[PDB]
Design a protein around this nucleic acid. Structure first.
Ligand SMILES: Nc1ncnc2c1ncn2[C@@H]1O[C@H](COP(=O)(O)OP(=O)(O)O)[C@@H](O)[C@H]1O
Ligand SMILES: Nc1ncnc2c1ncn2[C@@H]1O[C@H](COP(=O)(O)OP(=O)(O)O)[C@@H](O)[C@H]1O
Ligand SMILES: Nc1ncnc2c1ncn2[C@@H]1O[C@H](COP(=O)(O)OP(=O)(O)O)[C@@H](O)[C@H]1O
Ligand SMILES: Nc1ncnc2c1ncn2[C@@H]1O[C@H](COP(=O)(O)OP(=O)(O)O)[C@@H](O)[C@H]1O
Ligand SMILES: Nc1ncnc2c1ncn2[C@@H]1O[C@H](COP(=O)(O)OP(=O)(O)O)[C@@H](O)[C@H]1O
Ligand SMILES: Nc1ncnc2c1ncn2[C@@H]1O[C@H](COP(=O)(O)OP(=O)(O)O)[C@@H](O)[C@H]1O
Ligand SMILES: [Mg+2]
Ligand SMILES: [Mg+2]
Ligand SMILES: [Mg+2]
Ligand SMILES: [Mg+2]
Ligand SMILES: [Mg+2]
Ligand SMILES: [Mg+2]
Lengths: 309, 309, 309, 309, 309, 309
DNA sequence: TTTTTTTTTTTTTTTTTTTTTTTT
């Protein structure tokens, strides 16, 4: 899947160097190849003529150049898509949630944004025959709305055993906007010792709202948010996983998502949710590079997301 | 239950720094662990080294990482819930009011919100075998509708001595929004010395209506409200108590609650009350993370909330 | 009772400060302790660095904090209730009109609201041992229906002195909404020197019906009204006076009061009137914080309000 | 259309010198004629008395003097334009995007910058008689939004062979700003072996935002960008290709492009995009040395960009 | 209107000395008169005892002595001035752009600098009775924005055959800073054979930005720029022509031109441009020897610079 | 006012020797007495037995030795001072511009130094009882910003005739440093035939910057400048006139004058000019042996330098 | 032993309110 970080111990590079890189946050050779010279120079003990050797060796083990469009097409026709549990939603997105990008979901209260995440936390483990990825799940929660009792029911629906289903999921809660960025290094270190398929952030902007209050703090807030989004995208490129994030709305003094232009330009796919009749809900594609604009209906039942009955 | 704050006095940290932190508002190690470095820096007399040492010690004391979902399920199985006094209501709520989150009640005039809060303030003290919480209650009133004469009868119903029931409630009245926000620090200071189990805030939005007037003052109003809500949630995290708040309605020019999206997105459970025939009221679940939509019927009597006769 | 506003002159405060305060409208320490700082920073001369000085003062004069509910019971067990002239009404009200809160009376034309106001304006002077308030009365008229011969006849019924009686009632007439609101400052000034015991507003929504017209101004109307209502409560908080307000009805399209949700939520007690046979009338309790629903009968005579014969 | 660098060895210059130059990053005689002397005296192995000879020889093969405006008028009269697929835009721009200069596109999210880049990557491969280039495309992606399925659809629209269309586009992904600058050397190497007609940078400012953060790094940012822009111009001088670059927007704390005065003075043409009704968009000319302000409308379909019905 | 250099060869000076002097870069007697001795003793083949002869010989042909201010006043009255195409501007300038001086035009992007330079390039050939100059223009472009079609549009406005108006302009493009300085020698050689009456340099600081980079090259950059300005002033003195340059701006971290004190002190007149409403622009007087501050308004049309409707 | 040279023709000294002295640049007995024996040798015609006799002569007619303080005080009390024209300026300088010294004005562009020079040039011709000298003007120009029209306009405000105001001014233009120093011999010779009260050099360092460019040529530029300043001082002492000189500024990598330490020590009075609001300017004394350091405000108007209205 | 020079560069959204009025 990836190139380990111990393949760089050659031409004078020792074990202390690799240990220092590990302590900094780099855990594979891809991370080394993706960083610029100044970032390495900021690492204690890494002087010049070590940085040039590290970069040249990493670029030797990893390619960064030109390839035809046909090669990229061939490599893209093998990416895995996750299944949502509903056929209308699968048809709308062309198969499901894809790996290697970022999907964003926004709407008002009780429109079903976290039930879908709960369903994907179980659908990412089943065999690839029925639309899974045979992996684990990482969950980051900033609101306090995570419940395993729904996972047990969804597992029962999909044919898995409860103990294994709950044993293949890792959970963490965030308390401010620095802890949120700190958890990503731990995630990257955990992902290189086993196999993962999905990452969830629920939600992104909830803690940024109160930590930077009013005009006079807007610039710092937007810079911090941009850093977080770049780190998430780098994780997705490193490990080949799927990333899902949630967002809130505000009124135009008829409603729009929060986060400014950084958020709008950073996401790859954007979906909007609306309330319907009874237990039904409506979904619409707002932004995407390869799908047209359309809408569909889904429903919430005791065992997860499904089609209208 | 929580880690005292005097355990952060190692590696040459003087009691003057601890006293300054307490005067700022923090009274547990968890509280220091939950705050970003900017907040500590704003305090006079705290430098970079002091802040770094404080953060490291707190993080070592309190766990902040990744666990498994089975472990979290096993922990959540031990959370207790409080009985409301009505069997249909308890069945509708999955057992009663749950600790660790926030519940909001809304309706029009004379629909039963204040009486339910009174009955909860009495029931949160009875032995845990029958459904109590064995603690004290903290009541914050902003309209002037608190009446101990009701608590006397409700306590008589469950078999308590009126003086014990009356002495174990701490009451406070507010006169504008700033006093409202200020009282929370005194609440937190009081909490860390005794065993509390419930906080009540009656009409969080009554004072905000007239302190800010018309368009041109909306943003400041919403920002102040957001800070208030975040402080409430942090208290719930720190001490593992239950929090109840009430709200008012307005007409659509058929009735909806006031407060906007800031209030809609930050509550965990939402209940709507309606007037019925005689002394009977109707209750509906409008929002929840693990319950479906359902309705029930309860009644108001001289001794509190109960089942229809 | 109310502490004078001249006690805010201990450190760094002169007589000019109190002068501009009394020009603004404040007439007691409580009036300054219950006010927000933004309001303080709006009087020419008080710019900044002095509002905090006043706020810190009066904080040790006016008590503000958390107390036990048993002490609140002890405090509230010493309030004053003024008789209504009818025994059935006194029994239905649990003692009589209560000071510190707001009581509303509504009904259709010639049902007996204004006669009750006239009776109260005299009963609020007799000694406490017979149900009287032994103070003065303030009366505000908005329809041109104040008739002083009724006062003489009623006062004779209760064994008073007509010359003594007629000089103990303050009478005002208003011509528009702004004039109505402005009379409240003179009311506070008059209450600042001589004791009073009751405020009567008859009626409260008469001029609002005309000064604001069409759907294009409702938003402003309900805002203006809101401020008025808040101001009334503040007086009851300072000097401990009983407020009595009157209101009209409209047809549903069988009758309901006017004012909307602002009025419905802002009142503490609500009573409804209907016409009986001959001079008799029927009264009903439509809302209350501590009383059940019940009905009663009274009657109108040459000398006020009494029991049916 | 360019003089090969191998002609630089005539008398006194050996193949080793040309090899050293090629390793430096010069691939044509023009690249030597346009370079200052202190740039030439910076490649190890090159000594004085040889840079002078190189410049003297290059000046002989590449003309650098004075001419009359009639000659310039004729030469610019014989120049090529690339069709955008929309007749409205072609009429607005006077033919279309022209080879030799820099055209910039700016707007907010989902306004259609990337769809026009995808359309141009196909129209740059069709014959000259129908507004084509008869070249190849270079695509540099800093966002990760390149999708070859759109290429196949558009190619079928314009009557190409999808296999060949996929073999005639070169694609690269950049991970930081130094990598972005370094890819231009490989671009220069590639264009000197086979004919190209179009370069796309999508987008130009995305990685600069996070690589340099804050006030203290603004100058070094704007200097780096300057170099990049200058390099782009040189390519258009050397091989005669069209350049298209993409840009984002920000809010005036009503929206403006990012990049500053360097960006504003370095671009020869600027276009602004806005969101219309359905699948329709509005285009406005914001800068040009020969064209007036105006506006038009276009649409996004399954096969690319086109005219609205 | 100048003394040809062939007059300097009288007795003891041969033709080869004149040929060497011309190869050095001097083409007029005034040129030798204004040059110091030290740089005369820098051309190979020029030995002492001849520089003294040249300095003595030329002083008798070019009057360099003390004169009365009345004679100078008379001389400064038969001075040419060229119309800018707008009546508002000519009044603010006192007649046009004066020959023998240096005028600078600065402003942000698309403010009309290059358009005014394109209009001036035509009026410098129309007869004297209407503000013309009856000569030729020398145009130096360092950005790529010179368009011979605007000249075609503007020429017919003033009544010219566009072929003549096109053949009477000399155009040259520069690529680095040293080329820019090298072109001035050819310009000076051209001016000594036919009648020219203007010189445009657009822009003057574009290539200096990137040829020197950082704080470590500022001194050399600023010393290189001084020689350019001195040579321009020498050409203005020698042949009596107007000299017009253009400049860019930066942000003060509201905008200022670039170039420093060297540029600020060397120009005779300075004018700033700004963007108006529609096709309307504003012009200001920022520095002059004998003019007061004042502002006007002009407009850009398809036929050049004019008054606002 | 001084001893004519022709008075030194005595036993042994003939007309030819005095003619040789006149040709060498000595046009006064003081000039002969001001030079050291060494200097009176480069002339062609005197070797020895003549220089000693000349030194013995030219010293009995000119005192060179000790005096008292009171005698010098009495002789210096009869020193005429020119008037600036602005009362604030006249007060600031203790009476106006003095004679027998050197004044240096420096500042950034368009700060008003040249206008002040023009005003002094016309004011030196007014009758003495209002602050004049009753003499002519000597103007030496290096930048090329001399305008007679300002003199024509400034002659009116003082009652002088225009034609006679412009008939008493000699003008010269300098083209390099050699010529700049050469002009002084002619200046002194002409002044030895009339009455003069003003010499102006404007500006003094413009031509030195590019004549001695770059390190390695330093330390010769400074010698040339020192010789020029010494010659100026000798002129001023010989004829008892006033001298004015202007200067430029550079930035410190907030601005300082150019020239070095030779300039700083050689000048007698130094003044710094700053830009103000509208047409106001600020002045500050920087160096003076018998003056305090203060700041003053003046203004520029169509008639000259005046008080701020 | 001597003898100072010379400016540069933009960034970045927020946040709802408030009922009226009888007819044969
Ligand atoms: N056990 C359950 N059975 C059926 N429906 C449920 C169950 N639990 C929650 N729901 C539904 O899911 C909704 C909650 O949506 P959620 O996705 O949590 O909102 P948000 O969009 O704010 O994240 C509730 O309105 C409820 O109707
Ligand atoms: N002792 C009592 N017995 C029966 N009903 C009561 C008693 N006290 C109050 N009530 C009823 O409770 C209602 C008031 O409910 P409350 O909680 O005050 O409404 P809200 O808080 O929503 O304004 C009234 O309609 C009243 O009839
Ligand atoms: N002096 C009186 N003697 C007997 N009955 C009276 C007298 N004055 C008024 N009433 C009766 O009492 C009623 C009082 O109406 P009022 O209270 O003014 O109506 P509202 O409450 O709408 O203002 C009248 O309808 C009238 O029938
Ligand atoms: N196959 C398709 N058919 C129709 N519309 C599409 C298709 N693919 C993408 N779109 C639409 O094109 C829009 C433009 O996206 P894009 O031009 O990539 O945005 P940007 O201008 O930010 O680069 C998207 O909002 C999407 O709805
Ligand atoms: N033919 C034309 N008709 C009208 N306006 C034009 C024409 N050509 C260019 N312009 C306008 O001239 C303006 C300034 O262009 P230019 O003078 O080249 O700017 P600058 O001088 O700042 O480089 C542009 O805003 C453009 O819209
Ligand atoms: N006739 C006039 N009326 C008013 N102000 C003038 C006139 N002529 C020139 N000025 C002002 O004088 C200033 C030029 O000052 P100048 O002597 O050139 O300064 P410096 O020589 O220090 O550069 C300009 O700002 C200009 O506005
Ligand atoms: Mg939600
Ligand atoms: Mg209520
Ligand atoms: Mg009435
Ligand atoms: Mg985009
Ligand atoms: Mg421009
Ligand atoms: Mg100047």
């Amino acid at each position: 899947s990836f190139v380990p970080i111990e393949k760089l111990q050659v031409n004078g590079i020792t074990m202390a160097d690799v240990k220092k890189l590990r302590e900094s946050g780099l855990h594979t050779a891809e991370a080394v190849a993706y960083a610029p010279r100044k970032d390495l120079l900021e690492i204690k003990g890494i002087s010049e003529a070590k940085a040039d050797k590290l970069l040249n060796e990493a670029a030797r083990l990893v390619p960064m150049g030109f390839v035809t469009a046909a090669d990229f097409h061939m490599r893209r026709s093998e990416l895995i898509c996750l299944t949502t549990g509903s056929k209308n939603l699968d048809t709308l997105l062309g198969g499901g949630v894809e790996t290697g990008s970022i999907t964003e979901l926004f709407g008002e209260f009780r429109t079903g944004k976290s039930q879908l995440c709960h369903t994907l936390a179980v659908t990412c483990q089943i065999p690839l025959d029925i639309g899974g990825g045979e992996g684990k799940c990482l969950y980051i929660d900033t609101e306090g709305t995570f419940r395993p009792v729904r996972l047990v029911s969804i597992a029962q629906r999909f044919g898995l055993d409860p103990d294994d289903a709950l044993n293949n999921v890792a959970y963490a809660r965030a308390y401010n906007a620095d802890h949120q960025l700190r958890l990503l290094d731990a995630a990257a270190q955990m992902m290189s010792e086993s196999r993962f398929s999905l990452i969830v952030v629920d939600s992104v902007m909830a803690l940024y709202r109160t930590d930077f209050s009013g005009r006079g703090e807007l610039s710092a807030r937007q810079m911090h948010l941009a850093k977080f989004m770049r780190a998430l995208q780098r994780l997705a490129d490193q490990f080949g996983v799927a990333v899902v994030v949630t967002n809130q709305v505000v009124a135009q003094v008829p409603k729009k998502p929060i986060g400014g232009n950084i958020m709008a330009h950073s996401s790859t796919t954007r979906l909007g949710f609306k309330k319907g009749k009874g237990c039904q809900r409506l979904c619409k594609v707002v932004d995407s590079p390869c799908l047209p604009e359309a809408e569909c209906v889904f429903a919430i039942y005791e065992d997860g997301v499904g089609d209208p009955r």
